[PDB]
């Protein structure tokens, strides 16, 4: 199947022509941070010049901000060396977009990824419940096959259908190698994907959607795992009202 690096999505004209030949996924508006449809420091002791030369970690495993899933600000005692500003600095894993046999486009590791590595943030338009129902009605009228809604918090759904980044290509697996982590950046909640184990180079990156299905028919799962649940969404259908947070 064809593949494409994250640099290929920065040129809209070249991408739109590759899409006509099926070498790249269908066009969407590339964004690097959530767009709303309707508009203290940690206590880590700063690392010395010797500690940074050795390779020691600033705001590592012990950081108090890291523990409450809060990213540090520019005012961090470790300053520019703080390793707890990954969403802000876009310190993404090396990933490529690939065409899968039956799930549409997907994401794959371009390098070996250690466990608990930040992959990408799940970006998109943040909708309230009325706006979410409006998009549900539009996508139902369009007969869309793929769905890009991610529950963020009460009355906040991220919709990556029209605007988002390459995280919108992460497929579901019943035995996944990634998970979401909800992080607070400047008081705002964000969802990111993180590896849950060592992911070898060339492997597809997947997560458990824990899908809340409002559709009448459930989508069959093609994850190919021995423990496959057979469907995205399980047995029960919830109402449009309940699926959206």
């Amino acid at each position: 199947g064809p593949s494409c690096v994250m640099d290929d999505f920065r040129d809209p004209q070249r991408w739109k022509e590759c899409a006509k030949q099926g070498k790249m996924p269908c066009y969407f508006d590339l964004i690097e941070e959530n767009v709303y449809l309707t508009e203290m420091q940690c206590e880590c002791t700063p690392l010395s010049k010797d500690e940074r030369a050795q390779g020691e970690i600033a705001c590592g495993e012990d950081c108090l901000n890291r523990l409450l899933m809060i990213e540090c600000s520019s005012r961090c005692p470790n300053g520019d060396y703080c390793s707890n500003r990954r969403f802000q600095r876009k310190q993404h894993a090396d990933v490529e977009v690939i065409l899968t046999e039956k799930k549409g486009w997907g994401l794959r590791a371009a390098k070996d990824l250690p466990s608990n590595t930040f992959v990408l943030e799940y970006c998109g338009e943040v909708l309230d419940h009325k706006e979410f129902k409006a998009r549900v009605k539009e996508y139902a009228r369009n007969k869309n096959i793929h769905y890009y809604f991610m529950a963020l918090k009460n009355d906040e759904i991220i919709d990556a259908t029209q605007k988002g980044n390459c995280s919108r290509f992460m497929n579901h697996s019943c035995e996944p190698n990634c998970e979401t982590q909800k992080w607070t950046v400047n008081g705002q909640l964000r969802v990111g994907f993180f590896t849950t184990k060592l992911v070898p180079s060339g492997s597809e990156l997947t997560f458990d959607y824990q899908f809340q299905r409002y559709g009448k028919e459930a989508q069959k799962c093609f994850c190919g795992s021995a423990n496959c649940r057979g469907y995205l969404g399980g047995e029960n259908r919830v109402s449009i009202r309940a699926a959206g947070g």
Binding site: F149, Q181, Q210, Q212, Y214, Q219, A243
Partner: peptide, 12 residues
């Protein structure tokens, strides 16, 4: 409608 749903992040 026919298809559709919402992905739910793990409880964090």
């Amino acid at each position: 409608q026919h298809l559709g749903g919402v992905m739910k992040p793990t409880y964090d």
